[PDB]
Structure formats: C-alpha cells, structure tokens
UniProtKB/Swiss-Prot annotation:
Domain of life per record: Eukaryota
Organism of this sequence: Homo sapiens (Human)
Swiss-Prot/TrEMBL catalytic activity: O-phospho-L-seryl-[protein] + H2O = L-seryl-[protein] + phosphate; O-phospho-L-threonyl-[protein] + H2O = L-threonyl-[protein] + phosphate
Protein known as: Serine/threonine-protein phosphatase 5
Gene: PPP5C
Binding-site residues, substrate: H69, R100, N128, H129, R225, H252
Protein keywords: Acetylation, Alzheimer disease, Amyloid, Amyloidosis, Cell membrane, Cytoplasm, DNA damage, DNA repair, Hydrolase, Lipid-binding, Magnesium, Manganese, Membrane, Metal-binding, Neurodegeneration, Nucleus, Protein phosphatase, Repeat, TPR repeat
Length: 315
C-alpha cells in the first residue's frame, strides 16, 4: 500500500491531489483512510444546523453545482474548469452525489475530503440519493459492497443522515436539492428544526426538500415520481414572500442545457452530471453567484472521457 495517506490522521490539500490522482487511475483508497474521513466528517456535519446560513461578503463569489451522481471524471472536469475548492473558491454541491454512476465511491470520498479540508467553504447538501433506499436499488450500495463491505456502507449511511437539508446565502437565496413544500406556510425557522438524522419520511417537509419539482401551471400536483409534489409558481412566490428571499436554486432533474429558470426567474435548476448516465446527451453547468449581485451566472460544460465501466454496474 503506496496509496495516499492522511498526514497526522487529518486531510490535507496534497492528500487530496493525491486522492484525485489515485482515483483518476482507478485505484482504491485504503479502508482505514476511507474509514477515518467518514468518521471525521460524521463529526463535522453532525453539529451542523439543518439549515446552513452563509454570508457572501461584497467581493467573495461561491459556485453551486447540483447532481453529480458518480460521474467522478466529470467532477474532476468541474475542478479543472473552475478551480479547486479552497477558502476562496467555495463550493456548494446540492446532493445526488451517489447513485447511477459507476465511480460513486470516488465521488463521495473526494467530496467528504474537501469537506474535511475546507469546512466553512465547501458545502454538501443532502440529495434524495443520500438515503438507503435509492442506495439499495441505484448502485451505491452494490458499489460500496464491492470495493469495501456492508459495514463500510452502513457507515456511509449514518454519515449521509447528517448532511444539512438546505443552505441560504445572505438571507436572499435558498438552495436545496428537490424543492419547496407540499403544504403552505413553511418558513426558514421550520427547516432549521427539522430533526434530519433519519431516512426521510414518506411526506412532510423533509421529504419535500429532498423530492419535489416545480411545475409551470399555478398550484400543486401529485409528483409524477410517487412522493412529494410539483409546486407551481404561486407556491414559490408565496414562500419567497413569507421568508423574505430572492429566489431558490434546486437540482434533481436533468436538463438538456444543464440549467433551467422556471417560475419567472424564481426557481433555478442547476444539474452537474453531464451526458447523465452516458446517455442523455446533456449539458451540465454550474452557477457562480457573487457577494454583491447574487444573480446567477450559468457556466456550461460537457462530459469528458471516463474509463469503461458501465452506468449502474454495481446495482
Ligand atoms: Zn434527485
Ligand atoms: Zn438526480
């Protein structure tokens, strides 16, 4: 074992360059590194508020990316185009880091490693795929079982379960993975007190954040996906008013250009797993907001080569 190693059991920027090289080259991080970072981040994440509140001062900027779902080479591509994470190049990854892609283990531990390395500048928000269920069917678990063991999987699970549900910036812009609410009158003070450390329930607010979609016509519909709902432009506009917000960024659904703006400006979708599943031809992008004009700028990019492992391989 000549693989990458923690200095003084604790992640560092050159461990990370190192993990990235190692992972580019399809090798495995050693179990006990895997294990250390997972326990460390359980720790970090777990004293985090369910609702993350961050402040971009006038001259800072932060990048917000959505699904990446195991397309690790395209993750590295993100970093090459936009820079490494660092205290001056902060990231939010709005969930779905795992599943479907065949380099989810690569994704997630790169992800947790930067979390460990830049805790107040590198943000992870829970997807609906950071959950046991999606995990048993779309590939994560098979993947972990194949490269480590069940044990290492349950540890992952326990970790995910501490992932914040949503993050607001300058009490102007709020980001979650899925969307807004099945019921009205939900406030930021509500999201804060969601006791998040569980598999999501069937319904209630924590379901929604993880699961709902926008629709174009005013109102709410049952979600074509079996859980939560589609909320209309009224729903969004109602919630922005109660809470005093400018608009929301969310992910969850693929997009032929890698973003959409729905709801009249009010509800933005970024999605950062290009040519999602080696199939859909799509563009991805990510978003730069900066401290003095929190308006989205959208940066497109498209999928690079990755090695010949098939989507879904581990399910
Ligand atoms: Zn999703
Ligand atoms: Zn997704």
């Amino acid at each position: 074992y000549s693989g990458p190693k923690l200095e003084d059991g604790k992640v560092t920027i050159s461990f990370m360059k190192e993990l990235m090289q190692w992972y580019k080259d399809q090798k495995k991080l050693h179990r006990k590194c895997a294990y250390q970072i997972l326990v460390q981040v359980k720790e970090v994440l777990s004293k985090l508020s369910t609702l993350v509140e961050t402040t971009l001062k006038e001259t800072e900027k932060i990048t917000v990316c959505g699904d990446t779902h195991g397309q690790f080479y395209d993750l590295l591509n993100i970093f090459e185009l936009n820079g490494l994470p660092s205290e001056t190049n902060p990231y939010i990854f709005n969930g779905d880091f795992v599943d479907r892609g065949s380099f989810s283990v690569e994704v997630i531990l790169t992800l947790f490693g930067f979390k460990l390395l830049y805790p107040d500048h590198f943000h992870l928000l829970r997807g609906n795929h950071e959950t046991d269920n999606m995990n048993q069917i779309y590939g994560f678990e098979g993947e972990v079982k194949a490269k480590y063991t069940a044990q290492m999987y349950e540890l992952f699970s326990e970790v995910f379960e501490w992932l914040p549900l949503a993050q607001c910036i300058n009490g102007k812009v709020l980001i979650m993975h899925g969307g807004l609410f099945s019921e009205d009158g939900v406030t930021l003070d509500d999201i804060r007190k969601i006791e998040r450390n569980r598999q999501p329930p069937d319904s209630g607010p924590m379901c929604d954040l993880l699961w709902s979609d926008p629709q174009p016509q005013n109102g709410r519909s049952i979600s074509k996906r079996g859980v939560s709902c589609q909320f209309g432009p009224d729903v969004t506009k109602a919630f922005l008013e109660e809470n005093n917000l400018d608009y929301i960024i969310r992910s969850h659904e693929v997009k032929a250009e890698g973003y959409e703006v729905a709801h009249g400006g009010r509800c933005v979708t970024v999605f950062s797993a290009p040519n999602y599943c080696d199939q859909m031809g799509n563009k991805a992008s990510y978003i730069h907001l900066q401290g003095s004009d929190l308006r989205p700028q959208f940066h497109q990019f498209t999928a690079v080569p990755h090695p010949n492992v098939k989507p879904m391989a581990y399910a």
